[PDB]
Design a protein around this ligand. Structure first.
Ligand code: FES
Ligand code: FES
Ligand SMILES: [Mn+2]
Lengths: 568, 569
């Protein structure tokens, strides 16, 4: 029955081996009796500031299992801290997924609890677990408290760009900027805006992989530990009911996630990770699904980078349950969630305590504010833009290309005061995709050249093959596929070329002949391998493009959780 | 870079905000981004690796020592490897965790690292990926657990599992007396209480100069262990300022000393594969033939299971491996540098021996000519290892009929079949259990003997395979046969009947079959299919190297330093 009994139930020479060592620290023999063993994937790390409190979170989950008669065991994987990993945390997104997948199948686990929070750590565990497909429940770590500074509030990342552009413009002092370090981010948890970590927590509960309310409650709130403990209870039942990830991660679950991602003004990185998760659970989902389901919908939460308020205000207003309830005419209602009820039955009666934060559907915060997927000769395989946090007057715009051949050249050249750029140009950035950076870093939201900032404007049309943080704003076209370092038509844009953007027409058209690109394409040579050694060589030579999830090619798909050979 | 962490923390731009504000979300003084040595502590704690269960208190011990010396301690996780839990074997996952530790050190602002390593595969996976960075690195072993206490006698980790199970199937031990010693064999924190792999690698780390003196043998629940993790936290901060990097410690002299110490302690056969992988990352010429050259003829000075009688607890109380290195005064590279800052002799030249019964003197060796021996012949063209420290002398030179098992499932079913034509003089042959055949190199070399033979009081008969063995195992077991049968090696061609000659004195493993018959047999040989068309295992089979080179992935060999990577925003 249980697969853990292939370890703990054997009455042979091997059963001694799988049991005698586990009893070295005092574990009662009844723990190996056949009750569900629960693996707790602990991404706790002091190098992951947003998950640094996951020791407590695991213990609450551990209590939950003991309450319900299960055998809980926590294990580690590589944790990813978006603020500290370099060249970028996305570079190691796939490496952590192999830790999760192999640690789950290789160990006597019947159920899985995922402690995820910090940006990249949410897809790392969701992707590795989907390839084993045991009864799995996700516990999100929770956001930080809203920043506090001089009687004002500070936003995670969103106020980092706004204040660094304000000092680059010369309108704010550099001393005031660095005085906000300890004042922006107090308290435990992940980014306090509607950035990647917050949307991915919403994606976890929009897909149905968590108990209701899991996304929005802050990390130091008491209900954070309640939900972790309550999910430690539920996962025991799910093992008995065999509620595997296959039954939750249906196509209707991904559509629902896309629907609420546009309703919350979600990160542009949710688009990439959701494709990678679908790529391993075995659900056909392309970028076109995001456009067909997303842009038509309005954005209903008034949170940065799209709005004003923060994740603290968002939870007190009702959180994701209140947002799903308002998508009641478009959500796949009978889509089951991890607690044994459909998504609509967990949110049909969710309250709303503040409509200035969570708007009514019939009176939304921003109309047609869902993410758009652009097509054209410059992005033949797709490119995304987030109009919720973009300038409307720039959504239909045409300008000359100011090209930055890579990120180094972009930093060597952006601050050049004798650069020929005005507000109406189109800043282009190349060689920052999966093979480009390497790792597809959040470099899309380029800081505007200082000459433009002093003029008094903070937005210009920027196109790139890189990502940007969910914390970021502006009119930024991202995930241009194929990337420049792959041979994509982005690699051939030169200074002076005219790029026209019409997000209403899904247009990213490069004004240049089909015959002129072909001579440029002949002189173009792919950049050299950045390491030719270690994980990075494996990454650049195996990672797929941004339009498919930026996953390693041999990691796509599932493999289940069979009972492997005995180890001796 | 002088203080590579200042590329994050000492930045006076926008990015400098990103790298500091987030770290300060739990209350960290701004002066921790001083430029003081930031010390990454790679914690392999997990409840699914019962031998690293106490590492949360170990990691805290390390931090204390870092805080004393004005450093910045940060712990971070990587995939942990519990050998008893991970199937089909924890070896298959060593190189994966090797990538975790390496990328976590290069991508994070770390001036120095502390390695918390206890269970078997947790030492190499941590040492390898650290060697690929060549940063100021200190290793901290978790310690062996207390001896097993059962019915007023002692139980040995791993060793007594083989010997009690071989007594159940021989019909002399209750099927329940086996399972009642279950909770009595392991009753404290730590790794295997024998001279298995986990204690050998702990002895390797200290003999390689990669740890403070006395690091190997300290039991986990003994208080000197926490003191050591605290002392290593003190020491690593000063090494960052001295820029004492791994390549300055892990030189050839260190590896040569490690081969010597492994022989005198009766170390595991698995230490051979892992040091070769460690050398392959750090960039030091070390070949399988070096192990026999430097180590075989050296005497075994340690009277521990599976070679002797006592347990790791006694080994610490007699002076640990420092007392062994002292008895090795006339063979070791005396002037090899260790982590504290003094040569290996200055750390051990006055090491006291409190018990000449478990740590013998050199001139009173427990066993002569007891180092691991590599073999050469038609059967193992790239080398095969054997541990005579736990073998039987009469079968050290032996020839007999072959009884073959095409894979391991075939063995689990044919070995017990009483209709099998085999006596105690036949050579047992097991195929398709090496890096690619199993997959991973599981410890199936110590094959259970035919139940017919065990009823004669026979405990040992010669057994060859391309598999590995438990460091706690024994017998005249030829191991690590390279190339493995799955990779096309000659072992795949052994057939029910061929005579196989063993002579470790001559280092000869010869299969008495014509050379032409073999190439004619290899006509009908077709490689086994990959176990998985997907996942890490697929990458593993198509990139793992053989046991002669350390079983690393080919694209993971060598080092890449630890230069400053590009900004992440
Ligand atoms: S830094 Fe962890 S959530 Fe953005
Ligand atoms: S089980 Fe960890 S030492 Fe053998
Ligand atoms: Mn082992």
């Amino acid at each position: 029955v249980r697969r853990s009994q292939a370890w703990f139930g054997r009455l042979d020479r091997d059963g001694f081996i799988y049991r005698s060592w586990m009893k070295n620290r005092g574990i009662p023999h009844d723990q190996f009796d056949g009750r569900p063993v629960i693996g707790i994937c602990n991404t706790f790390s002091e190098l992951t500031p947003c998950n640094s409190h996951f020791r407590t979170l695991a213990e609450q989950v551990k209590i939950g299992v003991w309450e319900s008669g299960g055998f809980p065991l926590e294990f580690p994987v590589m944790s990813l801290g978006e603020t500290m990993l370099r060249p970028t945390a996305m570079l190691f997104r796939n490496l952590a997924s192999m830790d999760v997948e192999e640690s789950i199948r290789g160990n006597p686990l019947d159920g899985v609890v995922l402690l995820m929070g910090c940006d990249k750590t949410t897809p790392s565990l969701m992707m590795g677990a989907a390839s084993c497909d045991l009864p799995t429940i996700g516990v999100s770590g929770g956001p930080m408290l809203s920043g506090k500074f001089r009687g004002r509030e500070l936003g995670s990342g969103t106020d980092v760009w706004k204040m660094s552009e304000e000092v680059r413009a010369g309108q704010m002092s550099q001393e005031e900027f660095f005085e906000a370090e300890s004042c922006m981010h107090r308290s435990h948890g992940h980014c306090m805006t509607m950035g990647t970590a917050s949307t991915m927590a919403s994606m976890v509960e929009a897909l149905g992989m968590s108990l209701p309310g899991n996304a929005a409650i802050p990390a130091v709130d008491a209900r954070r530990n309640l939900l972790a403990r309550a999910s430690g209870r539920r996962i025991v039942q799910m093992v008995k009911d065999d509620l595997v990830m296959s039954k939750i991660l249906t196509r209707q679950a991904f559509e629902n996630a896309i629907r609420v991602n546009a309703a919350i003004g979600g990160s542009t990185n949710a688009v990439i990770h959701l494709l990678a998760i679908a790529g391993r659970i075995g659900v056909d989902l392309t970028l076109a699904d995001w456009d067909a389901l997303g842009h038509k919908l309005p954005c209903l939460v008034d949170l940065q980078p799209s709005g004003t308020h923060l994740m603290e205000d968002f939870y007190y207003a009702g959180g994701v349950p209140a947002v799903i309830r308002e998508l009641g005419d478009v959500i796949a209602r009978d889509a089951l969630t991890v607690n044994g009820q459909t998504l609509w039955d967990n949110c049909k009666d969710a309250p709303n305590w503040n409509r200035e934060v969570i708007h009514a559907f019939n009176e939304p915060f921003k109309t047609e504010a869902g993410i758009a997927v652009l097509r054209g000769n410059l992005c033949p395989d797709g490119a995304v833009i987030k109009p919720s946090a973009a300038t409307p007057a720039l959504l239909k715009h045409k300008g000359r290309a100011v090209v930055f051949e890579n990120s180094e050249h972009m930093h060597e050249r952006m601050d050049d005061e004798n650069l020929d750029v005005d507000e109406n140009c189109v800043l282009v950035l190349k060689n920052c995709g999966p093979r480009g950076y390497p790792g597809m870093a959040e470099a899309g939201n380029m800081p505007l050249p200082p000459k433009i900032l002093r003029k008094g404007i903070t937005d210009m049309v920027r196109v790139s093959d890189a990502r940007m943080s969910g914390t970021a704003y502006g009119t930024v076209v991202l995930h241009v596929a194929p990337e420049a370092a792959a041979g994509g038509p982005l690699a051939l844009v030169q200074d002076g070329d005219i790029i026209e953007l019409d997000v209403a027409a899904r247009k990213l058209h490069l004004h240049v002949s089909d015959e002129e690109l072909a001579r440029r394409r002949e002189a173009w040579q792919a950049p050299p391998a950045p390491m030719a050694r270690g994980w990075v060589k494996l990454y650049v030579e195996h990672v797929q493009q941004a339009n498919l999830g930026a996953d390693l090619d041999f990691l796509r798909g599932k493999s289940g959780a069979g009972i492997p050979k005995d180890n001796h």
